[PDB]
Design an enzyme around this catalytic site. Structure first.
Site, PDB file in Angstrom:
ATOM      1  N   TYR A 142       0.881  -1.156   0.033  1.00  0.00           N
ATOM      2  CA  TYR A 142       0.021   0.025  -0.036  1.00  0.00           C
ATOM      3  C   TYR A 142       0.902   1.055  -0.009  1.00  0.00           C
ATOM      4  CZ  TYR A 142      -3.752   3.334   1.691  1.00  0.00           C
ATOM      5  OH  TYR A 142      -4.520   4.284   1.654  1.00  0.00           O
ATOM      6  N   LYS A 146       0.728   3.992  -2.981  1.00  0.00           N
ATOM      7  CA  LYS A 146       0.844   5.393  -2.800  1.00  0.00           C
ATOM      8  C   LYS A 146       1.820   6.279  -3.026  1.00  0.00           C
ATOM      9  CE  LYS A 146      -3.908   5.228  -1.846  1.00  0.00           C
ATOM     10  NZ  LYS A 146      -4.877   5.944  -2.793  1.00  0.00           N
TER      11      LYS A 146
END
Lengths: 235, 235
Positions: A142, A146
C-alpha cells in the site's frame, strides 16, 4: 449545463457522494468504475480482468465516444481499496500487486484522460495516502503504490507534463472519512475527528469553479478533523 | 568459500561486474535474470511474461532448491531498464507498465528473498534513481516506479518489516556509470565525471563484510564522480 466532470470510482462512498453533489449543482457527470452508477449521465465500464494497457484503451475509447467535442472541467479519481502486509507476510507480493492495480493504474489513467479531455485551467484531483508520507512496514505494498501516486502528482504539476495550460493537480490525503464501513467496524469512535464526505465534495466544487481558491498545483493535502472542524494542510 | 550472495540482474553491465568481483573474492554467486550468466555458480531464470506472483513463486522455489536451507550474506538487486514519456505521450501507460514490472517487481522479490534467506546482520541492496528525487515530467512512469522503490526502502529499514535482525538495506542512485552503451552513445563525453563500476562492487563487498562501514540503514545513496573522484551522499 453548468459543465461536465468525470468521477473515477463513482461507486464508492466518497465517489458516489461527489457524483451526487456535482449533479445537484448542475453538472453533467461521467462515472468510470467496475459497474454502472444509474445516477450518472454517462457510464464508462471498466473490466477488472483486463491488463493496464487494455484498461487504458477501453476507458479512453468509451470516454471519447461520450464526450465528442466537449471537454471536462474536472477529473476526480477516488478509486481503490486496501490490502496490507509486511515483507514477511505470505501475501506481501500478492497484495502489493493488488495495490498497484487499485491506486496506480487508476491514477495514471485518470491523468491520461486529463491530458486529453481537461479544459485549460481545469482541475485534476487524485487520492494519495497520509500514511505514505513515512515508512509503512506493516503495509509495504500500500505504501509503495501510494508513494508512486504522490510522485506522479509532482511530475504532472511540472512544466510539459502533458496537462493543459493553467490547469492544476491536487492530491488529497484524509486521515479519517465518515463512511458506512467505518461506522460499522469502529462503532464507538468519536466522530468529532471524522471528516464528512461533504467537506471534500464542497472543496472540489470550489476548486473547480474558482481557480484562485486552489492550493499550489502538485500539493499533497492532508485533511484532518478535530472538535468537529476540518482542516486542509499542505505537506 | 567466503560465503554466498545473490545478484538479481547478473547479465547487466553493473550486475556482471558485481558478480565477477564477488566470485574473485571467494564467494559463491547465484544469478537471477532473464538469461543465464555462465560465470555464476547457480542460475535462476525468470519468465518476464508471468505475472508478479507467478514470478515470485518461480524465483523463490528455484532459489530455495539452490540454497538448501543455507543463508546468504547479501542480496544485490540491479535489474531493470528504461522507458520514458510524459503523460501526453502515446506510450505513457505502456511504459509505466514496463517500468513498474522492471524496477518495482524485481525490488520486491529481492526483498522477499532477503526476509527468507538473508543472514542476520546481512545486507540487502536495491537500485533507486537520482532523477526520482524530484519531478520527472518527461519520464513519468520511470519516476513513479523508482519513487515506489525509494519508499519500499524506507519501509524495509523500519522495525518489523520482515528483514532479518540487524540487517541493513541500502539503495544506490548513481548519476552516471561507465558502461559500454554509454561509451557508444556519448563517445566524446568527459569520463572524469563517470563512476567506475568497480567503485560500486568494492563498496558492496566492504558493506557486506564490515557492518561498521555501512551508511545508515534505509539510506538513498546518490553517487557522483568529479575530476576522477567519486562521492557518496545520503539523501
Amino acid at each position: 449545463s453548468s459543465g461536465k466532470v468525470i468521477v473515477y470510482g463513482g461507486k464508492g462512498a466518497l465517489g458516489s457522494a461527489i457524483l451526487e453533489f456535482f449533479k445537484k449543482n448542475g453538472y453533467t457527470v461521467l462515472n468510470i468504475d467496475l459497474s454502472a452508477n444509474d445516477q450518472a449521465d454517462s457510464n464508462i465500464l471498466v473490466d477488472g480482468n483486463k491488463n493496464w494497457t487494455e484498461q487504458e484503451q477501453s476507458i479512453l475509447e468509451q470516454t471519447a465516444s461520450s464526450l465528442q467535442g466537449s471537454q471536462v472541467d474536472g477529473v476526480f479519481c477516488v478509486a481503490g481499496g486496501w490490502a496490507g502486509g509486511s515483507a514477511s507476510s505470505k501475501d506481501f507480493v500478492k497484495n502489493a500487486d493488488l495495490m498497484i492495480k487499485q491506486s496506480v493504474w487508476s491514477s495514471a489513467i485518470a491523468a491520461k484522460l486529463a491530458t486529453t479531455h481537461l479544459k485549460p485551467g481545469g482541475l485534476l484531483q487524485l487520492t494519495g495516502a497520509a500514511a505514505a508520507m513515512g515508512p509503512t512496514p506493516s503495509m509495504i505494498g500500500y505504501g509503495m503504490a501510494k508513494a508512486a501516486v504522490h510522485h506522479l502528482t509532482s511530475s504532472l504539476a511540472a512544466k510539459d507534463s502533458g496537462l493543459p495550460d493553467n490547469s492544476a493537480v491536487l492530491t488529497i490525503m484524509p486521515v479519517t472519512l465518515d463512511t458506512p464501513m467505518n461506522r460499522k467496524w469502529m462503532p464507538n469512535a468519536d466522530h468529532s475527528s471524522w471528516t464528512p464526505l461533504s467537506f471534500i465534495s464542497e472543496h472540489l466544487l470550489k476548486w473547480t469553479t474558482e481557480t484562485s481558491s486552489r492550493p499550489s498545483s502538485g500539493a499533497l493535502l492532508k485533511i484532518t478533523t478535530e472538535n468537529g472542524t476540518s482542516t486542509i494542510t499542505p505537506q
